[PDB]
Amino acid sequence: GSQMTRQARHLYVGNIPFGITEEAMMDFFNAQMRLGGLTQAPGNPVLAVQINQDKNFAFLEFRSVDETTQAMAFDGIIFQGQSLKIRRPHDYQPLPGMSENPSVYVPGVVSTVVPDSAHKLFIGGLPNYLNDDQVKELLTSFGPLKAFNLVKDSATGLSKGYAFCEYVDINVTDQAIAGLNGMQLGDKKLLVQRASVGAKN
């Protein structure tokens, strides 16, 4: 369809695996939607994927407004080691009577949106070659995460060596600090503290 028609029928997907094909991306999201019970009709909700490989993002094109909205619940899903960053197009406008936010939660998926808050953590000193899944697994031993993002270099996809997170249980925050702060990992030592402590400004 037209560009206007696509505003409510596609999503931005950032942090995509290097070298993934459009077909493999499409098959992944169709499988996740179908196997998660998140379709509104028989068949595949995702019609196409357009990748910008040099800029490390894709747009997923859906056949329906409601399926596009529900797919926002996959923000943070791990695929080939990467946490996919799912967002609305910047020009999205809510449509009359159509939900702006997903209605159903997808078990296991940890959001990449980590707002500044009392118990948001900064994790610094990570070896830059560890991927999102590996860092997530390091943090999850203390308890389940509500949100997590590993900061990547825009040009290499390598990490910048630091991440942010928020635990489901606010009390896990201090347990994760106690366990991980000062821990040797590679040639590095981790720094783990509430992000408000060292935030620039």
Author numbering: 141 to 341
Which of the paper's sentences describe this entry?
U2AF2 is a critical pre-mRNA splicing factor for the early stage of spliceosome assembly at the major class of 3′ splice sites. Two central RNA recognition motifs (RRM1 and RRM2) recognize a polypyrimidine consensus sequence (Py tract) composed primarily of uridines and at lower frequencies, cytidines. Structures of the U2AF2 RNA binding domain show an “open”, side-by-side conformation of the RRMs binds to uridine-rich Py tracts. Considering that the NDD-affected residues are located near the RNA interface of U2AF2 structures, here we investigated the hypothesis that disrupted U2AF2–RNA interactions could contribute to altered pre-mRNA splicing by the recurrent NDD-associated variants. De novo mutations affecting the pre-mRNA splicing factor U2AF2 are associated with developmental delays and intellectual disabilities, yet the molecular basis is unknown. To address this question, we determined the X-ray crystal structures of Arg149Trp- and Arg150His-substituted U2AF212L bound to Py tract oligonucleotides at 1.4 Å resolutions.
The Arg149Trp, Arg150His, and Arg150Cys substitutions decreased the apparent binding affinity of U2AF212L for this consensus site by approximately three-, four-, and five-fold. The sequence of the cocrystallized Py tract (5′-phosphoryl-UU(dU)U(5Br-dU)CC-3′) corresponds to a 3′ splice site of the AdML transcript, a well-characterized substrate for in vitro pre-mRNA splicing (e.g.,9,16). Like Arg149Trp, the Arg150His substitution indirectly disrupted Arg146–RNA interactions. For the Arg150His variant, the N-terminal U2AF212L α-helix shifted closer to the oligonucleotide. Arg146 appeared to be disordered by loss of a Glu201 anchor, as shown by comparing electron density maps in. Instead, Glu201 has shifted to interact with the mutant His150. Water-mediated interactions with the mutant His150 replace direct hydrogen bonds between the WT Arg150 and the N3/O2 atoms of the penultimate nucleobase. Neither of the amino acid substitutions significantly perturbed the other site–i.e., Arg149Trp has little effect on Arg150, and Arg150His had little effect on Arg149. Instead, the NDD-associated substitutions converged on disrupting Arg146 interactions with the terminal nucleotide of the cocrystallized Py tract. Unlike WT, the Arg149Trp, Arg150Cys, or Arg150His U2AF2 variants are unable to detectably promote splicing of a minigene transcript in HEK293T cells.
